[PDB]
Structure formats: C-alpha cells, structure tokens
Amino acid sequence: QRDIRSAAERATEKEKRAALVKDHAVKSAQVYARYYIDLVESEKK
C-alpha cells in the first residue's frame, strides 16, 4: 500500500483518529455496563 499524502497530513489525521477512538471508547464502556446490569435484572424479573 502506497500513500500519496505528506508526513504532516498523516500526523494530523492520526491524531484526529486517535481522539475519535478515545471518545467512542468512553461512550461504549458506559453503554455496555448499563446493558449487562439490565440483562441480569430483567432475567430476575
């Protein structure tokens, strides 16, 4: 795989991608903790 873009563009896009990933991680962690708790409670009910 051959990339046409320069080094600085790669660096900036890499930083943007990292930030996006971090935010998604936080959101998903919260959502899935809620989901597991809810599953257990609903089965008991």
| Contacting residues toward another protein, per CB under 8 A | 1-4, 10, 17-18, 21-22, 24-26, 28-30, 32-33, 36
Number of Cβ within 10 Å of residue 33's Cβ equals 10
CB contact at 8 A, 14 and 20: no
CB contact at 8 A, 10 and 3: yes
**Residue 42 carries which side chain, given as an amino acid letter?**
S
User: Which is closer to another protein, CB of 21 or CB of 45?
Assistant: 21
Q: CB 43 → another protein: shortest distance, Å?
A: 14
Q: CB 17 → another protein: shortest distance, Å?
A: 7
